Amino acid sequence: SGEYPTVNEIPVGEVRLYQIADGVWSHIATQSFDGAVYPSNGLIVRDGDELLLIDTAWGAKNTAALLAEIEKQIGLPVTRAVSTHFHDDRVGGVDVLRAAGVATYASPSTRRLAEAEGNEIPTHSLEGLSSSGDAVRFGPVELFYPGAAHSTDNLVVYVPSANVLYGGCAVHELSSTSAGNVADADLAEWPTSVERIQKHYPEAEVVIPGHGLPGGLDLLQHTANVVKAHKN
Numbered sequence: 001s002g003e004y005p006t007v008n009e010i011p012v013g014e015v016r017l018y019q020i021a022d023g024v025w026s027h028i029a030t031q032s033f034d035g036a037v038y039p040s041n042g043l044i045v046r047d048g049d050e051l052l053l054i055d056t057a058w059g060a061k062n063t064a065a066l067l068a069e070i071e072k073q074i075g076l077p078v079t080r081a082v083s084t085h086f087h088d089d090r091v092g093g094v095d096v097l098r099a100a101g102v103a104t105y106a107s108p109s110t111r112r113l114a115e116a117e118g119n120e121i122p123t124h125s126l127e128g129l130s131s132s133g134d135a136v137r138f139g140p141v142e143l144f145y146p147g148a149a150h151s152t153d154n155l156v157v158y159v160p161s162a163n164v165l166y167g168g169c170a171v172h173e174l175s176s177t178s179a180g181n182v183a184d185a186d187l188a189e190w191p192t193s194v195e196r197i198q199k200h201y202p203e204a205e206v207v208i209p210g211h212g213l214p215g216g217l218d219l220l221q222h223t224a225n226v227v228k229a230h231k232n
């Protein structure tokens with residue numbers, strides 16, 4: 001009833017939306033992985049009379065539920081989606097999107113990693129993002145490759161109209177006491193990648209992590225802190 005959604009409000013298979021700013025929502029869903037339940041976030045950005053989706057809802061049935069929730073709450077068609085790295089919380093559901101007519105995109109690095117891991121593969125390759133510090137425009141957002149962090153391919157997304165920074169899984173929530181699932185991470189490079197984000201988007205007003213509660217710019221420094229404590 002207005003607070004940011006959590007698993008206790010989200011059974012696995014359900015999706016809730018949260019208004020972040022004018023024309024910007026996050027989506028929240030829950031999924032089980034290795035016998036534990038996790039929330040995860042994505043983004044929705046209004047693109048005139050269409051919508052741009054950032055990340056799936058972590059699974060085929062969750063992503064179908066996401067589309068139904070968007071139709072209920074917003075009522076504009078999702079025409080394009082970008083996945084911000086290769087893990088199932090970002091690409092699991094791309095097949096559902098593609099069968100619902102959504103054009104799916106990711107960097108070539110994400111597409112190769114997804115293919116090698118056996119995860120769903122976005123259709124279209126996003127060039128111009130292969131070097132750290134690169135940025136490209138994609139509808140109403142900017143896509144930015146900060147360097148390796150949570151994964152080698154992770155992208156962040158900025159909504160300039162609203163100064164919303166969607167950090168994806170390279171950014172953790174303030175309450176986090178650990179650095180999440182780091183199996184594919186570069187813990188040594190991650191702080192440098194976070195510093196690049198901080199330098200590029202100093203006017204960000206909302207910062208959204210890949211999992212957990214949005215906050216402000218403090219999430220970036222907190223992420224560097226929890227990652228450093230993990231490495232050590």
Ligand SMILES: C[C@@H](c1cccc2c(-c3ccc(CS(C)(=O)=O)c(F)c3)c(C(=O)O)[nH]c12)n1cc(CNC(=O)[C@@H](N)CO)nn1
Binds near residue numbers: 087089212
């Ligand atoms: C699907 C993804 C995955 C699944 C389950 C959990 C997560 C987490 C995670 C975990 C804990 C917290 C709370 S916290 C910050 O307080 O710690 C959190 F916020 C996010 C993240 C992430 O951090 O983004 N992502 C996860 N995922 C990752 C991998 C890597 N590979 C493996 O795990 C191998 N065993 C192969 O299976 N594969 N899928």
Ligand SMILES: [Zn+2]
Binds near residue numbers: 087
């Ligand atoms: Zn991940």
Ligand SMILES: [Zn+2]
Binds near residue numbers: 089
């Ligand atoms: Zn994640």
